[PDB]
Amino acid sequence: TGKELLLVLYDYQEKSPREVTMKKGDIVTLLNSTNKDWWKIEVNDRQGFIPAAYVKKLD
């Protein structure tokens, strides 16, 4: 039933090639939450990892 949306809690600039930048208040798509520390998301045309603590699932 489609990928889950998350709310971005904090602005975050990518710090490595695998990461992605996001802005507070963005609604991003969860791609992979298997890691407890880093989740893979889609933020429009871009995808990458961010700190799991900095996003909240919109169940």
Q: Taking Cα atoms as reference points, which of 45, 47, 46, 43 lies closest to residue 7?
A: 43
23: CATH: 2.30.30.40
Q: Is 16 helix (H, G, I), strand (E, B) or coil?
A: coil
Give the determination technique.
X-ray
Domain that holds residue 19: 5-57
Nearest to 43, CA basis, from 2, 1, 5 = 5
DSSP 17: T
Domain count, the chain: 1
* Structure-token pair, residue 58: 């919109």
Give the span between the Cα atoms of 25 and 5, in whole angstroms: 12
